[PDB]
């Protein structure tokens, strides 16, 4: 469907978050899950799938527990060769009731039939206090791509280039990423909820719907504001 743009006072303010911004930042830092053409090898709960993906640096294999908002999504991708790309975590990563066992949400696309021979550019338009000063491209080889994956590439870029989640040097109070596909749009709040704690597991669960977009159609807008 479509989604109303943020009402005034709806967006999370970093000034009102008194925890570690570091714990938001690590999620969009260099480390992430990206595997190509793999199939689930196990499952813990009915709403998840477990992949075995290689670590090139240490030579071993790690397990990734991918979590979806329901059984239907897990059921869909279960015995399928896929691509997995997402912002993973460890703190409340459960394989039962730890570098080799990471968790994530969504980030899964069928491998076969989703490959372009030539990559597509998707331009991100960064607005700071209403002004499109920065724009940059992210390139994908996927026809249908998770919003998660685009969100990651976008924020990573911003973290490194614009100090996005620098606890001390970030200029930004407010932040949302808006995805536009035809006339329909949705957005995510890029800032942690107020108070003194931040739950990595809970924040990232917004990707467990596995939302996909078309990489030729989607436009990305990021709206930041300064303090």
């Amino acid at each position: 469907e479509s989604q109303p743009d943020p009402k005034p006072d709806e967006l999370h303010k970093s000034s009102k978050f008194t925890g570690l911004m570091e714990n938001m930042k690590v999620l969009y830092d260099d480390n992430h899950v990206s595997a190509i053409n793999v199939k689930s090898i196990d499952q813990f709960l009915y709403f998840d799938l477990i992949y075995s993906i290689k670590d090139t640096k240490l030579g071993n294999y790690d397990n990734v527990r991918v979590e979806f908002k329901n059984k239907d999504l897990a059921d869909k991708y279960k015995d399928k060769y896929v691509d997995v790309f997402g912002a993973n975590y460890y703190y409340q990563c459960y394989f039962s009731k730890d570098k080799r066992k990471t968790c994530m949400y969504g980030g899964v696309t069928e491998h076969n039939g989703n490959q372009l021979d030539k990559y597509r550019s998707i331009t991100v338009r960064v607005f700071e206090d209403g002004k499109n000063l920065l724009s940059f491209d992210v390139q994908t080889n996927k026809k249908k791509v998770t919003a998660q994956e685009l969100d990651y590439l976008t924020r990573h870029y911003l973290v490194k280039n614009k100090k996005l989640y620098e606890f001390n040097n970030s200029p930004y109070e407010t932040g949302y990423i808006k995805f536009i596909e035809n006339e329909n749009s949705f957005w995510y709040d890029m800032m942690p909820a107020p108070g003194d704690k931040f739950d990595q597991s809970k924040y990232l669960m917004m990707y467990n719907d596995n939302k996909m977009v078309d990489s030729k159609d989607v436009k990305i807008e990021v709206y930041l504001t300064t303090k």
Partner: nanobody, 131 residues
């Protein structure tokens, strides 16, 4: 195995200054809290300063406020404690401790000065301050 070796201690007069070093080996300074403690004879170990190496964020106990500064040198795999306006009260053995390296997570600052959190401690360096 993890090792922490402190240096830069010594014997000074009220108002003096020292710089403590801690060389770590067996692990990197990265992505953890590194912390300076001190212990008078017969008192418990107390936290004086900590730095989250991921971000350079710092926590200071009331005792060193306005007087001490903690810092890191990633290239040297070491942390440092600048100690200024020393006073006889600061006479303690000073210890460097390494916080745990959690995967993509850092423990809240409220616990950085708690000794119970730390599994890796150096020998310590003595600081004495004449009145």
């Amino acid at each position: 195995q993890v090792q922490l070796v402190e240096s830069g201690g010594g014997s000074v007069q009220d108002g003096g200054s020292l710089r403590l070093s801690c060389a770590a080996s067996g692990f990197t300074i990265d992505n953890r809290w590194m912390t300076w403690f001190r212990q008078a004879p017969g008192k418990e170990r107390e936290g004086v300063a900590s730095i989250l190496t991921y971000s350079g964020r710092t926590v200071y106990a009331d005792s060193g406020k306005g007087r001490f500064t903690i810092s890191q040198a990633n290239a040297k795999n070491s942390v440092y404690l600048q100690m200024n306006s020393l006073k006889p009260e600061d006479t303690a053995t000073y210890y460097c401790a390494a916080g745990d390296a959690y995967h993509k997570w850092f423990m809240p600052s409220s616990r950085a000065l708690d000794r119970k959190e730390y599994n890796y401690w150096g020998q310590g360096t003595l600081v004495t301050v004449s009145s």
